[PDB]
Design a protein around this ligand. Structure first.
Ligand code: COA
Ligand code: COA
Ligand code: COA
Ligand code: UD4
Ligand code: UD4
Ligand code: UD4
Ligand code: CL
Lengths: 216, 216, 216
């Protein structure tokens, strides 16, 4: 027996719960296991979109040895804090993808990814911990994505890009491909703004916006 | 028995007729009902892409009590005029979606929407009359869309956005999310240009273009 | 009996080989025919993502009268050179599309197109030789695409656009629709940059970038 959850019942989680249901009911063929929301804003249990929603204290108290959690909180500092808590409490991180999520050949994705509908992860891609690939995003060939990286919808991450830990890529941003000899790097904790057109390396901790992308 | 139609046999209608066929033949499982084009440019009936195409006078004359019409005219002033005519003549507005259109939980859409392939309508969204969501568009969580709103392809409408009546959002435009306390508003009859990156409220009747969006 | 190949085992080919497998195994229902990579960088055969990869000399030497090749090299000058070689050696060009590629009514596409996942080719479109439509691209109604045209991912080619031979359209570019009386023309060998917002005719051989698009 198993219990599933989406951690976060705000916008990120409410737009991922249908995806977690595709992952569980269809891709895993599991019509038996329960799925709930976890949200620490809750004191008493409530329902959110027809699912039971409870705080983490209550989720921990469930008498099941086999718990699986998708963290659906876009803020990657929160997501890492929760992931470390879950692993320490013996709860499994759970990767979710949609029926329309396309995964190509020789792709490695660490546990706990949120891979939205219409996402493509192309050939020979490696992705670290609790990746968020929101609706329509793609990661093209030979990319290396670090831990707790977050894509907004419709991110165009072209080939031979290396995105370091905790970077955030905003809605509709486009990143130029690297080459085998020179991957294009997005530095640790960098923020690429909505609609940014990135044609050069982004330094660690930089905020870049516009077409062409510039420091903000 | 029933008769279906796509009103408009120009570009909007010719790119929606396949979608209306997915809605009718597959999602409704109806292999019996006829589907035609209506276009008031026509005097004599013709064929358009292998479908009978007639003017509205001829469509009205069909002896069937049960008529269902998708209005496939992007101009929302025309679309409202036609919708009011259809309802007054006792013809039903008909929502169409594609096989790849994704509708999430607790979504309310008024009759007569044109929901193209690869469209996502995310959680807890409310949409008014004869919405056009062209190819690849999305409406994220907690949005409220008014009546006769029109999206070009690939519109990225993020969460907690309120789009008032008759707004037009152009190809590939990106709109920043609001918050629960402050929805980002697109005003009545506003025009957001192709590729605009919108990060603030757009006044009623405003035309905005560019990255960042500015008045035109 | 038949033999299939993807010509190019770098990023373009490795992200198209899964698509060629959808075309062959599912859309053609062919679980018998072998599929390999061709790449002229190779001396000895190798494997690429679990497929045999060989140079063109070795592919020619295969004793099969019935060879079918998708050219997965984005550079259109190389693609034309290879296509002319294949036809002269009595090898067939092979169109590939994905399970999620949407083709609408009265569409004409010459042999050898690479039509990626999530691509839409809308109503009444005509496309010439070895077209590349990378992930998420669309070509809307009444477009005429010439020979050896190349789209990056997420190109938004709106209606009544004429793209002449060997043009290249970059990632996420948006092109304004033409009208029946005045198609918007992208000239022969023009380059439209990533994220460009094109609202006017692009001259032959021009390079245009930005929002709005300007000469580079
Ligand atoms: C880039 C970003 C991080 C800046 O955040 P911020 O520092 O809070 O920015 P503000 O909203 O205060 O705006 C700062 C200024 O830059 C502009 N700006 C903000 N984001 C911009 C963007 N993506 N492109 C261009 N200009 C932008 C604002 O209009 C403002 O201009 P002003 O000083 O002339 O009034 C943010 O705007 C962004 O792009 N976030 C991603 C949103 C998103 O992708 N949503 C998806 C969730 S599903
Ligand atoms: C914004 C828009 C409404 C302006 O329409 P318009 O007033 O007829 O504009 P024009 O074509 O006369 O162009 C006005 C000027 O702004 C520029 N411009 C037009 N649209 C622009 C856009 N989206 N972004 C930036 N600049 C734009 C033009 O190049 C022109 O510049 P110029 O005066 O230097 O020559 C229109 O260009 C647009 O974006 N419409 C949406 C197209 C679309 O989404 N198609 C989808 C159908 S499937
Ligand atoms: C437009 C393009 C062809 C220019 O190529 P290039 O001539 O080699 O350009 P460079 O990389 O030398 O950049 C030239 C300058 O223009 C800028 N630039 C490049 N591409 C740009 C773009 N799309 N938009 C805006 N500015 C751009 C660069 O930042 C640079 O600025 P600088 O001189 O201030 O340093 C190229 O950048 C491009 O857009 N190619 C498409 C990439 C793509 O679509 N990938 C998909 C493959 S899956
Ligand atoms: C306001 C905003 O920009 N939200 C955007 C954000 O939504 P999130 O749900 O990630 O963020 P939030 O709206 O701040 O909500 C976070 C939720 O996490 C919960 N939480 C938190 C910490 C914790 O330790 N436990 C816990 O449970 C917290 O109680 C809250 O319900 O990213 C999405 C991808 C966007 N679509 C959405 O618009
Ligand atoms: C030229 C242009 O920009 N067209 C764009 C427009 O196409 P539409 O078909 O909406 O607009 P149109 O090309 O002006 O055609 C309108 C059609 O509606 C018909 N009609 C009208 C009024 C009426 O009362 N009865 C009636 O039938 C009219 O006869 C005509 O055939 O929006 C699409 C989404 C775009 N893809 C397409 O490029
Ligand atoms: C570096 C770069 O920008 N690559 C981009 C390019 O990849 P390509 O595979 O088209 O280009 P390449 O990386 O230069 O590789 C070309 C390949 O074609 C091969 N080849 C060539 C000639 C010939 O006559 N025989 C032959 O076989 C050549 O040996 C090589 O393996 O377009 C894709 C759509 C992008 N995703 C990808 O990032
Ligand atoms: Cl898209």
């Amino acid at each position: 027996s198993k219990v599933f959850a989406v951690y976060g019942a705000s916008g990120c989680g409410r737009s991922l719960m249908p995806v977690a249901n595709e992952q569980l009911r269809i891709l895993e063929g599991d019509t038996d296991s329960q799925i709930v929301f976890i949200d620490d804003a809750l004191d008493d249990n409530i329902t959110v979109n027809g699912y039971t929603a409870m705080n983490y204290t209550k989720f921990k108290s469930i008498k099941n040895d086999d718990k699986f959690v998708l963290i659906a909180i876009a803020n990657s500092s929160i997501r890492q804090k929760i992931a470390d808590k879950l692993v320490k409490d013996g709860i499994s991180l759970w990767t979710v993808q949609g029926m329309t999520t396309l995964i190509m050949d020789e792709v490695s994705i660490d546990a706990g990814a949120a891979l939205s509908p219409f996402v493509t992860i192309a050939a020979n891609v490696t992705i670290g911990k609790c990746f968020h690939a929101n609706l329509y995003s793609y990661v093209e060939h030979d990319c290396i994505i670090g831990d707790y990286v977050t894509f907004a919808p419709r991110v165009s991450c072209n080939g031979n890009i290396h995105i370091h830990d905790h970077a955030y890529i905003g809605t509709g941003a486009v990143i130029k491909q690297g080459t085998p000899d020179k991957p294009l790097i997005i530095g640790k904790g960098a923020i690429v703004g909505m609609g940014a057109v990135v044609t050069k390396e982004v330094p660690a901790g930089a905020v870049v916006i516009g077409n062409p992308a510039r420091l903000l």
